[PDB]
Symmetry: D3
Subunit: 202 residues, 6 copies
């Protein structure tokens, strides 16, 4: 075979993949009880009642299908949208009908620096009949304020993917793009973190 | 083989490919009598007397070589330029020396929606010795005003390529690309742009 | 095999590759005595005493490892930084401990025009344990003022790479990115040449 | 994109693809009323009552699912097996429950010669959850007796695939395998044609 | 990214990869105390005193470097060679200097059938400066006697790789070769199993 | 980019590539005055008067087109055939109309060993409209008598390609291919084969 900085995830039912969710067009991940994060350009395409699916892997199944109950955009310029779902599944996952028993939120990392290895996990290919999760690895190029840039292979559906460090702790949320190219994430500054904690379902 | 969102067009002498023309560096397509559409960043590299070729495919031939007679940039910000050609071919196509007999313009689509399948058809590799036409498929991500964004594999030479729906109706013109399933950016034909184009079709 | 607009350089100890240097995260190239060029977003990550390596190729060796002695960013908008190194190698090259005897600066080309063939030569993959030099070919799309655009396969590490014409003369410096994509360089205008000549070590 | 001697067939419900059928592990194609052809190493894995599907394409549907009613191996050395199916579909195709109304047999070509372009049409990837038909093009290298050799990209599932000329006429049946490799088929000699005609369901 | 039936193994220090060993040219795996298996065409290239390395992964290290003490070829036609190593490492692994503490032998599977998923694990690229383990997945095509055939992407260095089922139990040893091609293994018949058990170091 | 054991040769007008010739379906290489070597399964598709081309590279030109004048198969089992050409080019190369002035034969290597790096140089894609020369690198797996096996990416058209060591000396002729790092099979030049070739070089 060959070196490859992106590979298909064959088992999406183990951590960290159990923190990731699919939209028809994009990716999101869990941040707290009944609460997911994605980009604003993703959430504009959705409304209350639309469905997300928890860590799906084509016909190997998933953690359940859930409906969106609230969409809250961050008021700053950063591309962050908090989405709450109804806790009771439309279709159950293997751990039952409760959203939170089928998913796992991430710990925030202590920080991030140029040169460290990150992973972007998400559903790179939008509007497919089957959901396939890919893991894209690469180094951090820069952390400046609320901007984190890394070199990786990312595609349009990665919008909303978590960016994790080597210990599966959260360093960012992807928003825009062999391919070892600069790719762009929102780094969680204290003001963004505060907006998120405030909009987690209580 | 493998899934691939871009493949070589092996017969460019059937519809929809007989709508598409090649520049040395880019793509365009036919909009009406003696008239083609491309981007402003393409037309700035050309002038009256420069040559375009109709639906070429390496040494399989083409629908003729024609000279440019007029360049008319759209006055708005969108990246659209109208180019008229001399009707009399420099080199004939199989349907003769008249440009219009060797090409086919597209019908406009009724609109376009996020999630629908499009195709971008054009000459993705600029400044080659042989013209090779590729078809790039993918879903529309967004339509907002004159901006249409789709996820596809497009390349530098695709500047000017038509963006068609599943029934080969026109939804846009490609202008920028900034596996590969990447957001790619077209001009959606709003009424103001359609009016400009209609007014600049050779009479 | 297949047509490919980017291939691995297997001997980096011949011209023009002997004008190219590696940073941990990016590329640069020699402009004069003890002096290299790169981008401003590359030099931001380095400081006096950090190290660059002269035309490395995996474990086939290199022209030596050298320390940075001064960093001078171009005052204009263009993404150009001049870096001077200590002349005395930290680790020697095959031609000895003097930086200048192990490298080769480029001649400026007379100019550059749309459609001509260029090559971008550099270390495309950032933060690797081994330095691998690739050569990316493609045509110039546009030259205007200080902006040169070409169609090529470039990646995040190519920041700082020379852009040469078919006679290995210098037409620009890469700064931003099959793939036949528009890629962007700084074209050396008289004002930029003047800044560079003024900042070559004496 | 790139030159490629193998591409996915996106509509398998037009000629010539309507002459091709799938087994779980391999390909076959229609030779006459209720009758298909494949290799002897394919038919070894099947029995009466096993199922084949007519020109499937993922979830875009198919020409119907049919049961095997008889397996007849060619007495000679050549890797040819005739399989008859029950005429009445287990699951219908768009043209109804009759096998014959949903498929199309091929005309034999007048012959075949070195350098002419052929196509091998079949299901290259064995034992998949979804059937994906690919078309592999390439030139004939040699024809001798019952042996036709061509240069193409074929894979293990292509056992049993038709080999057609540029007018979709039949020149052989694949049996054994960028990749532009010599690939091997059975050329239909008069003795083989005679066996086949004798074993077409009446 | 894309579907791929072969991927780089990033951590070779967990089971099942801790059963695999590298030769300069090929692969082998552990069958018992101080004892490995490979092909006869591999062992002909080695002699007492030559080195094998336990589950290496470029510069991430390995389970130790060990010397060959005995080579015993199976007397039948099948491509099987038992190699014993000196128990005391030339260079230790993380579990110390004893060969057997750094490696793990496999359980034989109860049998194997057409259509089941297998994995071939080994070092596909011979005579490299760094050892990179790849995992190639695919279905079993046939089990006939001492022959097992599967559809996979295998390369010259895979000679000697174990072929494992989905529970990491042993089904074969690879000996000869997108690429989904038939690939050929020795299936462990009782007579082969007896030869192996008889030549395990006591 | 990526590691790749096969790449396109961009200048076929330098050594070692000026040793290699193209058939419509296969490769060969020069062994001496007016004489080339290929496989028996290639030469059986050719006859006196058929044309080979010297070191072509698409439209960059070539060292001339020459006609075959004699085919002499090796009497042993190994897959070797000697082909002589008419010395006077049908179409000249840059060094003129004489075949020998436009090509270069190889020196034989002193031998070959498992683990050493070789190159297979040839025209891997048969029956194309344009001749494209590729170089496939990889290690020797085994040498036994007249059999040399190496791990490389070779294709149908590589039949007849020379197999050279790191100093461009001849170690073998490729005959069969049965990423891709696969065992590939050449004829190693034993003394009996060398003698046959020397005796069949045009005088
Ligand atoms: Cl980039
Ligand atoms: Cl993108
Ligand atoms: Cl582009
Ligand atoms: Cl082959
Ligand atoms: Cl195969
Ligand atoms: Cl192999
Ligand atoms: Zn490989
Ligand atoms: Zn956005
Ligand atoms: Zn690439
Ligand atoms: Zn395939
Ligand atoms: Zn523009
Ligand atoms: Zn990709
Ligand atoms: Zn090839
Ligand atoms: Zn910058
Ligand atoms: Zn591509
Ligand atoms: Zn790409
Ligand atoms: Zn392309
Ligand atoms: Zn068979
Ligand atoms: Zn290949
Ligand atoms: Zn392959
Ligand atoms: Zn992808
Ligand atoms: Zn063997
Ligand atoms: Zn393939
Ligand atoms: Zn690369
Ligand atoms: Zn032969
Ligand atoms: Zn491969």
């Amino acid at each position: 075979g060959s070196e490859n900085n992106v590979t298909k995830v064959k088992d999406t039912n183990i951590f960290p993949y159990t923190g990731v969710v699919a939209f028809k067009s994009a990716t999101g991940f869990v941040v707290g009880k009944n609460t997911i994060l994605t980009n604003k350009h993703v959430s504009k395409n959705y409304k209350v009642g639309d469905r997300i699916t928890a860590h799906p892997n084509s016909d190997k199944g998933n953690g359940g299908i859930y409906s969106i109950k609230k969409i809250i955009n961050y008021p700053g310029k950063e591309d962050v949208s908090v989405i709450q779902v109804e806790e009771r599944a439309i279709e159950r996952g293997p751990k039952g009908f409760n959203f939170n028993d089928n998913v796992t939120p991430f710990k925030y990392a202590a920080g991030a620096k140029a040169g460290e290895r990150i992973k972007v996990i998400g559903y790179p290919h939008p509007y497919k009949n089957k959901y396939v999760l890919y893991e894209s690895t690469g180094p951090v190029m820069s952390v400046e304020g609320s901007s984190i840039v890394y070199s990786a292979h990312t595609e349009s559906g990665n919008s909303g993917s978590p960016v994790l460090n080597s210990n599966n702790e959260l360093v960012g949320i992807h928003f825009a793009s062999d391919d070892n190219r600069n790719a762009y994430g929102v780094y969680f500054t204290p003001e963004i973190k505060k907006f998120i904690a405030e909009n987690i379902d209580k």
